[PDB]
Design an enzyme around this catalytic site. Structure first.
Site, short mmCIF file in Angstrom:
data_model
loop_
_atom_site.label_atom_id
_atom_site.label_comp_id
_atom_site.label_asym_id
_atom_site.label_seq_id
_atom_site.Cartn_x
_atom_site.Cartn_y
_atom_site.Cartn_z
N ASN A 73 0.78 -1.23 0.00
CA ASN A 73 0.00 0.00 0.00
C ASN A 73 0.82 1.29 0.00
O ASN A 73 0.59 2.18 -0.82
CB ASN A 73 -0.95 -0.02 1.20
CG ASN A 73 -1.92 1.14 1.19
OD1 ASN A 73 -1.53 2.29 1.36
ND2 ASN A 73 -3.20 0.84 0.97
N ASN A 82 -1.32 0.63 6.81
CA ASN A 82 -1.47 1.55 5.69
C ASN A 82 -0.32 2.55 5.59
O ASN A 82 0.66 2.29 4.90
CB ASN A 82 -2.82 2.25 5.83
CG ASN A 82 -3.34 2.77 4.51
OD1 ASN A 82 -2.59 3.35 3.73
ND2 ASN A 82 -4.63 2.56 4.24
N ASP A 141 -4.39 6.82 7.31
CA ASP A 141 -4.01 6.39 5.97
C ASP A 141 -2.55 6.85 5.81
O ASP A 141 -1.68 6.36 6.53
CB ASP A 141 -4.93 7.04 4.92
CG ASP A 141 -4.95 6.26 3.61
OD1 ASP A 141 -3.91 5.67 3.25
OD2 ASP A 141 -6.01 6.24 2.94
N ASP A 193 3.44 11.72 7.00
CA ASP A 193 4.75 12.31 6.72
C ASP A 193 5.12 13.24 7.86
O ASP A 193 4.25 13.78 8.54
CB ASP A 193 4.75 13.13 5.43
CG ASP A 193 5.22 12.34 4.22
OD1 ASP A 193 6.13 11.50 4.35
OD2 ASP A 193 4.66 12.59 3.13
N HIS A 217 -10.41 10.77 -1.15
CA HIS A 217 -11.37 9.88 -1.79
C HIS A 217 -12.83 10.31 -1.81
O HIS A 217 -13.67 9.58 -2.34
CB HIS A 217 -11.24 8.48 -1.17
CG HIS A 217 -9.89 7.86 -1.36
ND1 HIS A 217 -9.47 6.75 -0.66
CD2 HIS A 217 -8.87 8.18 -2.19
CE1 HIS A 217 -8.26 6.41 -1.05
NE2 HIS A 217 -7.87 7.26 -1.98
CA LIG Z 1 3.86 11.40 1.44
CA LIG Z 2 -2.58 4.48 1.70
#
Ligand SMILES: [Ca+2]
Ligand SMILES: [Ca+2]
EC number: 3.8.2.2
Length: 313
Positions: free
Chosen positions: A119, A174, A228, A231, A286
């Site tokens: 993923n 994820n 999800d 960073d 999404h």
């Molecule tokens: Ca990134």
């Molecule tokens: Ca992802």
């Protein structure tokens, strides 16, 4: 209550099925992946380059192996070569060139087991790639995910070419990130286990060497979804897309509960990426299957592709 900021978001592009894996290459070009693209009910994911000015999209790669379409979902840019390492939910790990050509890195891991669909991934400063693998075995094997069952794994593809499964039994791992000391030493790995609303941490002792596994942070909400993509910013604050919450969570260096939340103009942020040397964060989502951007309080943590190969002169 946890402080919440509402920065002004700007639409970048749209019509990207399953918009994910935002990444910048060594030349500053921007790419995203469209894992949800299907052709007659069969996977046909795409890797696209986006024009930051017009928002125009160019399909650079539509990966397929032996008749099986790929589902590119996450990316990292290499340092010594301008090529993208792409986590694919159906093909595993791919290395993609700007010309569109690609290569499948491995059909099996270091123990000879069939590879699991991947993923997202994160390069540490030593060149090792840490990868989440929430899917079942790669094509031609039948598809399946670990949203319910705990068979999601974590891999570390080392600079020596070893695809090592470093942990498993996760319920849909994820997002993933690596924390570095100021001398560049990787020392902590953070893994998002989406549905359980947890962020897990491990101490990194070396290439593919992790220990002291523990629950590091808690993702707010009871909604379907959870952490999800993620960073670090330059101060090592961890920004995490909380899919379904309409927010991007911000964790301080010590984890626990978010120190701040970032309200998004959409409910399902999937991933994010900083534009090099700027405070600009690009976000894939999404709800509208689009890409946006907003200004954070500081620059992002340098990605491996931006680091010095020979150190500070
Ligand atoms: Ca990134
Ligand atoms: Ca992802």
């Amino acid at each position: 209550e946890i402080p919440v900021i509402e920065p002004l978001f700007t639409k970048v592009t749209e019509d990207i099925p399953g918009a994910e894996g935002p990444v910048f290459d060594k030349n500053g070009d921007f790419y995203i992946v469209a894992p949800d693209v299907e052709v007659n009910g069969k996977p046909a994911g795409e890797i696209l380059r986006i024009d930051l000015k017009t928002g125009k999209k160019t399909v650079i790669c539509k990966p397929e192996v032996n008749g099986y379409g790929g589902i590119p979902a996450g990316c990292q840019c290499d340092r010594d070569a301008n090529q993208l390492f792409v986590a694919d939910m159906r093909l595993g790990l791919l290395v993609v060139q700007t010309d569109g050509t690609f290569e499948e890195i491995a059909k099996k891991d270091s123990e000879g087991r069939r590879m699991q669909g991947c993923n997202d991934c994160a390069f540490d400063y030593e060149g090792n790639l840490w990868i989440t693998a929430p899917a079942g075995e790669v094509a031609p094997a039948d598809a399946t995910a670990s949203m319910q069952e705990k068979f999601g794994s974590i891999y570390c593809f080392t600079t020596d070419g070893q695809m090592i499964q470093v942990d498993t039994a996760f319920q849909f791992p994820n997002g993933i990130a690596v924390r570095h000391m100021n001398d560049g030493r990787p020392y902590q790995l953070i893994v998002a286990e989406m549905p359980t609303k947890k962020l897990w941490s491990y101490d990194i002792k070396g290439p593919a060497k992790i220990e002291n596994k523990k629950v590091w942070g808690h993702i707010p909400g009871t909604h379907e979804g959870g952490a999800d993509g993620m960073d670090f910013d330059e101060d090592n604050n961890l920004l995490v897309a909380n899919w379904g919450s309409s927010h991007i969570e911000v964790f301080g260096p010590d984890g626990g509960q978010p120190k701040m939340r970032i309200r998004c103009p959409f409910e399902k942020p999937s991933n994010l990426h900083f534009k090099p040397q700027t405070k600009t964060i690009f976000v894939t989502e999404h709800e509208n299957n689009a890409v946006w951007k907003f200004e954070w309080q500081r620059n992002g943590k340098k990605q491996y592709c931006e680091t010095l190969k020979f150190g500070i002169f």
